[PDB]
Amino acid sequence: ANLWERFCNWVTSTDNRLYVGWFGVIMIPTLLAATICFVIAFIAAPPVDIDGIREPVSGSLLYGNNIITGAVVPSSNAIGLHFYPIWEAASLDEWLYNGGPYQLIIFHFLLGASCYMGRQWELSYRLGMRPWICVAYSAPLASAFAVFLIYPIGQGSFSDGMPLGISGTFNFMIVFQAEHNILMHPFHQLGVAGVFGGALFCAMHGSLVTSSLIRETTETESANYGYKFGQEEETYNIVAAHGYFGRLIFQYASFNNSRSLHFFLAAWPVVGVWFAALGISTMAFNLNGFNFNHSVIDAKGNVINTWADIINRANLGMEVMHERNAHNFPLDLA
Amino acid sequence: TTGERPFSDIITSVRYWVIHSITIPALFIAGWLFVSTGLAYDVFGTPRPDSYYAQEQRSIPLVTDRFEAKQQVETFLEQL
Amino acid sequence: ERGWFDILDDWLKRDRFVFVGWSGILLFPCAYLALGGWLTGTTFVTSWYTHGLASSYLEGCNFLTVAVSTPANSMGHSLLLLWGPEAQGDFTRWCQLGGLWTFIALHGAFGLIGFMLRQFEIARLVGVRPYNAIAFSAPIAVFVSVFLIYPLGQSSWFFAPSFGVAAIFRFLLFFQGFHNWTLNPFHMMGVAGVLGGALLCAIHGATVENTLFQDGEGASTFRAFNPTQAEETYSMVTANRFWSQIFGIAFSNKRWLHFFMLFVPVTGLWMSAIGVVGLALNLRSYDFISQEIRAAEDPEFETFYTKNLLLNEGIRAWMAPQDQPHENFVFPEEVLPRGNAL
Amino acid sequence: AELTPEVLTVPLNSEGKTITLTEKQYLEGKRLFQYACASCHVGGITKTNPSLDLRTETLALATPPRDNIEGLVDYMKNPTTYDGEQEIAEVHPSLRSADIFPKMRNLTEKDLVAIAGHILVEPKILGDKWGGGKVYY
Amino acid sequence: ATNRDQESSGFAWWAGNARLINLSGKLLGAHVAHAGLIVFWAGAMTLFELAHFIPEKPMYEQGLILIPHIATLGWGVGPGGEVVDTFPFFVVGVVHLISSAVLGFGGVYHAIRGPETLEEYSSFFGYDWKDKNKMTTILGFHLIVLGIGALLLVAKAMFFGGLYDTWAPGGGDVRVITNPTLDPRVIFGYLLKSPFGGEGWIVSVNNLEDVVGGHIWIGLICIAGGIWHILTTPFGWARRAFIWSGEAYLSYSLGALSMMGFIATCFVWFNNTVYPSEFYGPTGPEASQAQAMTFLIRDQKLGANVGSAQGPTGLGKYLMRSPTGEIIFGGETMRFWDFRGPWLEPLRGPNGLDLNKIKNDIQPWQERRAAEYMTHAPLGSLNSVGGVATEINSVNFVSPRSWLATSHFVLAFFFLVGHLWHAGRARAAAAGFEKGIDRESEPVLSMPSLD
Amino acid sequence: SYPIFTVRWVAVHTLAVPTIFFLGAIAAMQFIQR
């Protein structure tokens, strides 16, 4: 075997402690680049002029932040969707002022995470598994694409991409609500159903399997020693679990087929989070949540407020305050 | 099985639909009339489109007293 | 031995389509009334006298905007019983006063107790361990802290969540504007438990479905499972290798895996409840004092933390007059905080 | 409260003569205002020039006065600046500029009266909300 | 019934269409019937649009997506995009609807009456997925069909009335394209353009000469490519690189359509050339620029010196510099300085927006257009209430650009999921483990432990 | 052979009976005008 052939064999080897693979050849350098830049920036980057109004926002620990307030700040509104690599700046000082690290990080991260998804297909193939774990991971991936790429494209600026920080995340959410009424959008509502339901079904499945573990241990030892890695026999009694849950609700509301049960566990949160991702990706083009402002009117024509109008009052508060120095004209059109 | 007749058996039977081609529409029509006669408004105390405000009033009839709340609403309804 | 109690016990515990049990005596009426009360209120009942809002299909609201709204602030924490000193037996006035809110909240509370008792009862009869009941303590901690403890620490039931889609959305935004609830580490642990739970749900389901053994000829693989089979339907060894090589770590113990699935979202919800208990007393994670001292002294210092407070300040000023009508707030245009142009 | 004849009675002209609109005219007024005007004048404000609103008091202080049917109908034929000094048909929708504002092409004299009536009745219903902007939402 | 249950096909009802993989006659029926649905919609939807169409109202105020596609081709419209004749819209609708019956007939026939498989009936129409030469031959037929389609656009543009040109000197109008761009350095230069701001890859195409010449190239490339594929069979390197099966081919097409969907999203969002704003409404960038223009005009009329007006931040209130120095509109629209539109370009000089032209040369038609576009920005709720989320009810508006961008993002995204689903499955099926792991031949059990 | 009235019968009707009634009520509401 020649050099190339042996290299290919190593790359695709099923015996590496961490699988590399062809997607891995792209994933590894991009995730390392994104990680290293992120850490340095989160610790040490100077304030960034996110909104292009020469009002730099401090995101880093050394510049007066803590873990909760700290962020890698999105690139300047002056840049918009322009590609802003290091070599486009006159200097690192300029690059930093204008939020160059944000673009470097998100572009490397999105590529690496796309390759993380590809890698999951790839190893499944090498191991003779079925191939769809990567399809499950497409839900969170799509959501990352939504907030870091699609939304900025729709709005015309990476300054409106989600910040890489805890408080910056909340800022993104509040402004999003003000401008799109996301709470009143059915795709976000589906998303909530997906995550609330995913948590519910997680607790459900966890509790039901744990409830029906077959006695294999003494009182003084952890029941977990009752299962041995790679044993052929199932470790709990599904018929007993079904007998319980079918009686909790009714028989035909409970699963007795483990494969069907686990498919449901996969599909519920995944589909919900797909819709969440699509909410953000379509509000990116300003098709917003339901608007029932002044929908209920009396015989004379007096507006009779609903909870929708109270939501509206909250949204107006966010709207008028956000980016308080950025707007010169009466409408916030992007 | 737990003993009760299967739902599929029941809802495909002639005797079920003989009974329910009557009970279902009757209940639907009863509900319709609950609203159409205006009885729903009076049972629950829900204002009609013309009873939210007096003609020149532009102040909401909010309850402000705990134990004289019932009389307050009555007073508000007199003022209509 | 075989007296009326034992005879009643026999009947309650009959294997029927809908199991009843002793717990059913509490559960079924309270659950039915909570649900019935909600459907009744959202279909027919106004919030005009308590909130100045329309809130029913009858008034023109849709599924997203209907609600059974909380009583007026002047009601304090009145139980607001139908026969109580506020409504005095008058059903119409009771509805107009927000009596359906306490009706739903209280029947709901005793309903959840009955449901968790049902979880204990069925588990005992079927001979399984009661982990499902235990996990349900999380939904109970949430309902109790939010719908009961929170308003009880506040001025009245008025500030409890109203039972409606948009009304709940309003509750979220109120918590952002007034409590800065996103900054609270107990809410943050809640978020981690919910999103972590949803992650575990998705990843475990997908892993099982993609490490299945071929136990049939069908390309649709669901029929190749028997409830009574002794063998695992998927390969834990293959699943373990995949994840170890992809992520660096993997489960190796199936019992730990499934317990961890209980633990994560259950613990998260519990943490969020503790945060809300604090908010009952306005004991918020509202500020970082160091940030405020710096910002006050240095008008060039800005972080995402300071940006979010400005939004909160807007939420409060703009929503308060209509959201808190008992206060009779009149904020002249000139006092309203606004940035440039908007 | 009801949309009474009294609510629907508005000034026809600068002299003091009133006209009482029908409920049908009210509906038509709202429909036509939405059709031709709302994109800029939603809720009685003016999106492209917020300094000028459709409040009755503002209209009264316009030149010539626009707080009546005649003034408003005339505005819709030959719009002027607020001081009456310049004719703005070329940049404001009107019958005179129906060629460049095509939605005006099928507006009859009857339609103009309905729209005018809408503008005058709406604040009688909504009060300060009309011409108030987001503060009053 | 053959292969019409799970036990005989191996596929449950919910994957029922997988029963068709090796039944070419029924599968042809499926496809022809489906094409009938597409054509049905194009026809019926057009007629619906026309029935609801008010000619003096802008199309974009009327929830129209198809009539704008017809108008862009130069049918039914005159100067400024004004509708002069609705009959061409009627023709397109009717002919599609009529045609959908024919396809429906063929689809229904082949699906339930004709031969279930085509191989014994016809060597020409029958096919085996694993037959690589036959697969590339059918591909070749369709490439020729597509190349002819692209040339039909060229034909309309050059010999049959032209296309609507938003850039036409003197104002937007239908224009015959006499001099299409054939220079391969220009045409293929678009393909090498960065997709980022101020560049925009192929979405940047800003004149009809490039559009028409691009289709000449594509028409000829597709025909040549089609002939090539009829006459050849896949090379060795291609054979070793691809999976050869019906599901594999489906997956490649799914990936391709996903990519295309994403491109169409950005096209309708940014491009105002092949999606004229006269028909589709202003772009997001356009409406934002138009608001700045509106208040510059207004305030300058009031006496403001718009060049020297310092805004609150210290940047110009109306006018500032781009990061490379060009004069651009100020405020948040600073992000949209790459925008180019016929109402704005007259004010643009070599240095960007020209202050002399701004002071002296703004025409009422420009003012009108800016005001029209500022108030028809592509913002609106799901229930079609126009404007920002906080707007009160009144204006029934959501831009065709929003409808088209959102729908196609959703579609493109799910088609990427579909690609991963089928590509992954096709790999597993070809390798022989799509139904699960062999208990007695579990691959991991023959591998050394990782540690 | 099969019983007609059961606990299941009651549970079904406690939900079914008001549901249909309510749906008729909400159907009628769709024709109410201010």
Ligand code: CLA
């Ligand atoms: C187990 C089922 C159950 C439970 C736990 C509850 C519980 C509740 N109900 Mg609900 N209800 C039920 C079923 C139930 N209900 C049913 C089936 C109906 C249909 C009729 C209703 C209709 C209903 C209405 C209309 C209302 C309630 C209300 C209430 C609340 C106050 C009850 C109270 O104070 O009574 C006190 C009584 C007891 C605790 C029982 C006492 C029994 C003791 C042990 C024996 C002593 C009594 C003695 C024999 C009598 C002598 C008295 C003499 C001196 C005069 C509470 C949350 C109120 C509420 O929600 O307001 C917001 C309210 O208005 N219920």
Ligand code: CLA
């Ligand atoms: C050209 C496009 C295309 C084609 C020809 C196929 C064809 C096939 N696919 Mg693939 N698929 C596609 C796109 C496509 N798919 C996309 C975009 C996705 C991502 C969502 C998938 C995900 C997918 C999965 C998970 C599976 C398939 C499967 C299959 C096979 C069986 C399909 C079947 O019987 O469905 C029957 C159809 C239904 C059961 C109805 C689906 C209903 C959808 C979810 C709702 C659509 C929403 C609609 C717009 C709104 C409804 C309106 C309502 C109010 C009436 C067949 C080979 C199966 C397989 O792998 O076979 C080998 C299978 O398990 N596909």
Ligand code: CLA
């Ligand atoms: C675009 C939609 C579409 C199309 C074109 C097809 C196509 C087809 N399917 Mg799939 N399928 C679909 C969606 C579709 N499917 C969805 C959403 C599901 C989930 C519910 C399925 C589940 C499914 C299963 C489980 C099976 C099929 C099968 C088939 C094939 C034979 C059907 C048959 O035996 O008819 C029998 C039915 C009839 C004879 C009743 C009449 C049906 C006709 C075609 C209705 C046409 C009406 C039309 C208005 C008339 C216009 C005529 C006019 C032009 C003159 C056929 C090629 C079968 C197959 O693969 O065969 C091997 C099969 O087993 N399908």
Ligand code: CLA
């Ligand atoms: C490319 C797709 C597309 C786009 C961009 C539009 C756009 C538009 N249409 Mg047309 N139309 C379409 C396809 C499309 N339509 C289809 C398929 C039909 C047949 C039902 C129609 C028939 C039609 C009529 C009769 C009308 C319109 C109208 C309109 C306008 C208003 C739309 C509205 O209010 O939606 C409201 C929004 C919704 C109903 C939400 C859609 C939710 C879908 C179901 C989600 C799909 C998600 C995904 C695919 C599901 C997959 C699940 C996954 C897990 C596998 C707008 C310009 C109206 C108009 O103004 O005409 C002049 C109008 O009256 N359309």
Ligand code: CLA
């Ligand atoms: C791409 C779709 C397609 C394909 C590949 C086929 C292929 C086949 N068909 Mg089917 N069919 C179709 C669609 C299709 N048909 C449609 C749309 C209809 C309704 C008119 C029918 C109705 C039909 C019937 C009733 C029969 C067939 C039969 C046949 C077989 C022999 C046909 C032959 O020898 O023609 C030889 C060639 C000609 C006669 C000249 C073709 C003239 C065409 C129409 C000129 C235009 C070509 C142009 C590219 C079309 C553009 C349309 C586009 C815009 C959609 C063969 C398997 C027969 C069968 O299966 O035997 C048992 C049979 O009896 N077809």
Ligand code: CLA
């Ligand atoms: C639907 C359109 C279509 C399809 C499905 C095919 C399919 C095929 N062709 Mg054909 N071809 C077509 C159109 C098509 N062709 C046209 C229009 C022409 C005329 C120019 C040709 C001329 C042609 C030749 C000369 C050859 C093929 C070959 C092949 C085979 C393998 C090609 C391959 O591996 O590509 C994948 C591409 C690569 C492996 C090259 C490197 C990939 C880089 C990274 C792509 C860079 C683009 C990237 C995705 C992002 C940039 C964006 C981009 C839009 C600019 C395959 C059967 C080969 C064959 O075996 O002939 C019999 C071959 O030699 N084709």
Ligand SMILES: CC1=C(/C=C/C(C)=C/C=C/C(C)=C/C=C/C=C(C)/C=C/C=C(C)/C=C/C2=C(C)CCCC2(C)C)C(C)(C)CCC1
């Ligand atoms: C309160 C009260 C009471 C009671 C009551 C009750 C109990 C009631 C009820 C009730 C009810 C019980 C009702 C009902 C209902 C209902 C309904 C109204 C419904 C509905 C529905 C719907 C509409 C549906 C829909 C849907 C869904 C959900 C899903 C998907 C799809 C669809 C769309 C289909 C009493 C007297 C004691 C006393 C005092 C008070």
Ligand SMILES: CC1=C(/C=C/C(C)=C/C=C/C(C)=C/C=C/C=C(C)/C=C/C=C(C)/C=C/C2=C(C)CCCC2(C)C)C(C)(C)CCC1
């Ligand atoms: C296979 C299959 C399927 C499918 C099917 C299909 C998809 C189809 C189709 C179809 C079709 C696709 C069809 C069609 C049609 C059509 C028609 C029938 C037509 C027509 C028309 C007309 C008659 C017209 C007329 C008119 C005129 C002329 C003018 C104006 C007006 C009007 C409109 C009136 C399904 C799923 C069921 C399933 C199973 C199997």
Ligand SMILES: CCCCCCCS[C@@H]1O[C@H](CO)[C@@H](O)[C@H](O)[C@H]1O
């Ligand atoms: C419903 C409340 C449950 C309280 C249980 C007290 C049971 S009490 C018990 O009941 C026996 C028969 O059941 C009798 O034989 C006996 O005389 C009596 O003391």
Ligand SMILES: [Cl-]
């Ligand atoms: Cl902000």
Ligand SMILES: [Cl-]
């Ligand atoms: Cl601005």
Ligand SMILES: [Fe+2]
């Ligand atoms: Fe499990």
